[PDB]
Amino acid sequence: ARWNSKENLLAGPSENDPNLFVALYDFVASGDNTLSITKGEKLRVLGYNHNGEWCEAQTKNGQGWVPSNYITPVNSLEKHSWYHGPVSRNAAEYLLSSGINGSFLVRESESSPGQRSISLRYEGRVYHYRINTASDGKLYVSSESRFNTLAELVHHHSTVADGLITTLHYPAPKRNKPTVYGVSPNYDKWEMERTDITMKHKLGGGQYGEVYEGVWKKYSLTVAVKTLKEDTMEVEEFLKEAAVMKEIKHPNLVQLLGVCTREPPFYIITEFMTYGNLLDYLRECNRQEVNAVVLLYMATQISSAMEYLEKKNFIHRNLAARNCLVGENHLVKVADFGLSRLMTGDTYTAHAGAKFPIKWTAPESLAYNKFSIKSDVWAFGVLLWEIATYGMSPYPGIDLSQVYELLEKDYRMERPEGCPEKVYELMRACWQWNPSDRPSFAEIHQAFETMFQESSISDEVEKELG
Numbered sequence: 001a002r003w004n005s006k007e008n009l010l011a012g013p014s015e016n017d018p019n020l021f022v023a024l025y026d027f028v029a030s031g032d033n034t035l036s037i038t039k040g041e042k043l044r045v046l047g048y049n050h051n052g053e054w055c056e057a058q059t060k061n062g063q064g065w066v067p068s069n070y071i072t073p074v075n076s077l078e079k080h081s082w083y084h085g086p087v088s089r090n091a092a093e094y095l096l097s098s099g100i101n102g103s104f105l106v107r108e109s110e111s112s113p114g115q116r117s118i119s120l121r122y123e124g125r126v127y128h129y130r131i132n133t134a135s136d137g138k139l140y141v142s143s144e145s146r147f148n149t150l151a152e153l154v155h156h157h158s159t160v161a162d163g164l165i166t167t168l169h170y171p172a173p174k175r176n177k178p179t180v181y182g183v184s185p186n187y188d189k190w191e192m193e194r195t196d197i198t199m200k201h202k203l204g205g206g207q208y209g210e211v212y213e214g215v216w217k218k219y220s221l222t223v224a225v226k227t228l229k230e231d232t233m234e235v236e237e238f239l240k241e242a243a244v245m246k247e248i249k250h251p252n253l254v255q256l257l258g259v260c261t262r263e264p265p266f267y268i269i270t271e272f273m274t275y276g277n278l279l280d281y282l283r284e285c286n287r288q289e290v291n292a293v294v295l296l297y298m299a300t301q302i303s304s305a306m307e308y309l310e311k312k313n314f315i316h317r318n319l320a321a322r323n324c325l326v327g328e329n330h331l332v333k334v335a336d337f338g339l340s341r342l343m344t345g346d347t348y349t350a351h352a353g354a355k356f357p358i359k360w361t362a363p364e365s366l367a368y369n370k371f372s373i374k375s376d377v378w379a380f381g382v383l384l385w386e387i388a389t390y391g392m393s394p395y396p397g398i399d400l401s402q403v404y405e406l407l408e409k410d411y412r413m414e415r416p417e418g419c420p421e422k423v424y425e426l427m428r429a430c431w432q433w434n435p436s437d438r439p440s441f442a443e444i445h446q447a448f449e450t451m452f453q454e455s456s457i458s459d460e461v462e463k464e465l466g
């Protein structure tokens with residue numbers, strides 16, 4: 001736990017050549033023309049690939065391609081271990097939910113660009129401070145101590161609290177490397193060699209279909225692999241999923257790594273989420289580690305994924321805790337299998353005779369087999385309840401044959417124990433009988449970010465209990 005570049009905090013912009021870059025995270029080659037780099041390493045950028053997601057760089061070790069958002073200009077604020085860029089208040093509380101006194105970070109508002117804040121951990125609590133800008137541009141927390149640069153402001157408060165609850169001692173660790181959408185900087189290079197993959201045991205006892213844990217030998221990398229059942233040539237369906245996946249690009253949607261569609265058996269290879277589904281995780285987790293701050297963190301990540309699908313005109317229809325996957329640092333990703341393209345202004349009709357997981361299905365879906373992004377919203381509300389109860393089964397003490405009847409009389413699940421009223425009201429909004437009366441995912445995600453801007457969800461939970 002050290003602050004390496006601390007003795008350089010007060011160094012000038014003019015001491016490094018402007019056009020150079022520095023590595024923000026370690027990157028291990030994922031393709032023959034890709035280049036391995038180490039955090040803190042300097043590089044020279046030669047150019048970008050077709051979508052700007054990758055760039056060709058030169059380091060002392062060689063020349064090659066690396067993820068564009070894995071590096072940053074030498075004089076940018078991003079090089080600082082304590083500048084976490086656009087991070088929300090709640091996310092900040094998560095990043096600082098552990099660590100020694102003095103752990104801190106500086107965050108910006110994606111919402112209101114320019115506005116920055118300092119989040120600090122002291123005696124088990126996180127404190128937030130607005131960084132003000134003077135009429136002449138100087139930054140400050142305490143009106144009597146203004147500085148020209150953010151680094152100088154940070155340096156000052158690492159020497160004396162002067163307004164903060166305590167001093168700035170240790171930049172909080174970054175969550176994790178951003179997601180790389182693929183393994184190659186080149187144009188549509190998804191196809192890979194089937195022999196390069198070692199198939200192992202099936203995942204989730206078959207509840208996800210033909211999905212096996214596997215190993216991409218070349219990179220000593222564990223991956224998930226979905227294969228097509230030959231006993232039923234639904235090839236068109238499977239192939240469609242591969243195509244859709246190639247287009248999906250979001251931090252919280254399971255990422256495609258490659259495919260084997262040249263000849264049978266067809267494969268769809270994705271990243272491996274190491275901790276299984278959110279439902280099992282919630283039920284087996286240590287509730288002291290996975291407290292309210294974490295639940296909110298996870299619920300927020302899931303809404304972000306759905307907001308992305310919402311604007312991309314896709315519907316899910318199987319949104320539930322069991323269809324969410326957990327990775328390192330409580331990272332959650334929604335399983336994007338079975339996605340359907342449906343223009344927001346339009347609805348989908350399932351095949352008569354097809355069964356539905358009743359407890360998560362919206363009224364219009366249970367009665368007319370109709371689905372839309374709004375029925376996904378209804379499902380999210382149920383999933384939110386699963387999160388708030390740490391995995392309980394929905395509608396306790398009620399038989400599936402009465403669910404619809406009860407819903408129709410405006411009955412709804414009770415507020416989970418300790419669940420803050422604000423969160424329960426969001427659930428109720430998702431469970432509005434008319435789909436149009438239900439909030440959009442864009443509105444749901446925003447609701448979470450502005451839900452605890454004054455106190456912490458922990459204190460709220462504390463009041464709901466005692």
Ligand SMILES: Cn1c(=O)c(-c2c(Cl)cccc2Cl)cc2cnc(Nc3cccc(CO)c3)nc21
Pocket residue numbers: 203204208211213224225226254268269270271272273274275276277325334335336337
């Ligand atoms: C179950 N599952 C999938 O269906 C897909 C996937 C695939 Cl392979 C193709 C298309 C769409 C998706 Cl969502 C990806 C995926 C990635 N990681 C995991 N991890 C996982 C799930 C259950 C248990 C365990 C524990 O070993 C670990 N599970 C995954």
